[PDB]
Design a protein around this ligand. Structure first.
Ligand SMILES: [Zn+2]
Ligand SMILES: [Zn+2]
Ligand SMILES: [Zn+2]
Ligand SMILES: [Zn+2]
Ligand SMILES: [Zn+2]
Ligand SMILES: [Zn+2]
Ligand SMILES: [Zn+2]
Ligand SMILES: [Zn+2]
Ligand SMILES: [Zn+2]
Lengths: 120, 120, 118, 120
């Protein structure tokens, strides 16, 4: 098929941001011309996800962050204080999973531990 | 300090399930001898997480699932229909983190694509 | 006979744990002073099994789980995802079964969980 | 799904043998027409196991033995010398588990003790 105007506006906003965006950040980024209700943002994000055009991950707090499917950024996160840093590059280096008759689009990879302040 | 009786009962239940459980599923799994209130389950889970004895991740739905920290099971999930399969083996088994005094506990690795039924 | 220090340390650890333990979990759980190589853990477990003091079962993927012989817990296991529930009671309690001396039984159920059933 | 030619060849060989077979025994049983690599045998057995079309049980040594899912044979085994005898019939007589939202396929039932030679 082809993208409706709301799906196109969300993909444009996700591409324009250098980072991931929460549903609320994405909602606040829309100007009058592109404006839609918050529930409409989430519905249209879900459709973009089902078409494999948007990726999602959750912070430890449960907040969802969205990005274009091609943005493959991974983090180290302290399980105590939640402090987080981005990895320089993806350590899988584009290698394929071993290969079950499943068409692969992307991976989320997140590392968890204790920062200097929190380590026992 | 050593693990109290409630912390031990939760670790036992998470080990016995062979996979992961939400806080509500963990609560429903406890036998008469291990049973405690739901708020007690959440408080004790949070403590186990902070001690690095339990790992947590979020499903695409935003539900939080818990497992023993050493249970390292990854999935393929269809972004269209939400069908999921567990991988028999971790494809990044033994990975080190690249580069200042951060103690690694675990990684979350999840693959997303289209299943046989959904692939265009 | 009587148990050597290594056999006693493994039986103590299996009794102290509220559930079954893999050989690797048992190995990691030992006190520093009683610690031994993983192959030594397996050799000593095999001796405890031969004396009828420890029971063993295998997960579908081949991992061995050990417990005191007296712990008679049975499971429902999904053959797809490996999700498991313990049965609250033994469903063959009181079952009947020359010169074979019976010590214990393993009883394990396999199927599809709600998520995996097509 | 449906069975590929390798899955069909393994099911045929397991049905043709009067009892259970290790992956290596199954591999050695295949004729020129049905032959495949050992790793292919294990991969295809694992798939059949996950689909509930073959049953698996482990000898005390850890060796995996496979059979058609409907073949329900149980044993008496000496824990000392490993000598084993088959039970003349299943004493559960097809009775169902008590009955959560779980579809039951089969049971493994194994008895353990000391043979005449072994009790000290
Ligand atoms: Zn921290
Ligand atoms: Zn990556
Ligand atoms: Zn690199
Ligand atoms: Zn699908
Ligand atoms: Zn892993
Ligand atoms: Zn399952
Ligand atoms: Zn029993
Ligand atoms: Zn014997
Ligand atoms: Zn039977």
């Amino acid at each position: 098929p082809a993208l409706n105007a709301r799906q196109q506006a969300l993909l444009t906003a996700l591409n324009a941001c250098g980072d991931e965006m929460s549903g609320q950040q994405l909602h606040r980024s829309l100007d009058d011309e592109a404006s839609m209700g918050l529930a409409t943002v989430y519905r249209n994000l879900r459709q973009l996800q089902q078409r494999g055009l948007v990726r999602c991950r959750h912070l430890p707090t449960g907040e969802a962050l969205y990005a274009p499917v091609d943005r493959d950024r991974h983090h180290l996160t302290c399980v105590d204080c939640g402090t987080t840093q981005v990895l320089d590059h993806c350590p899988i280096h584009g290698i394929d999973v071993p290969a079950g008759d499943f068409e692969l689009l992307f991976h989320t990879l997140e590392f968890f531990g204790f920062c200097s302040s929190c380590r026992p």
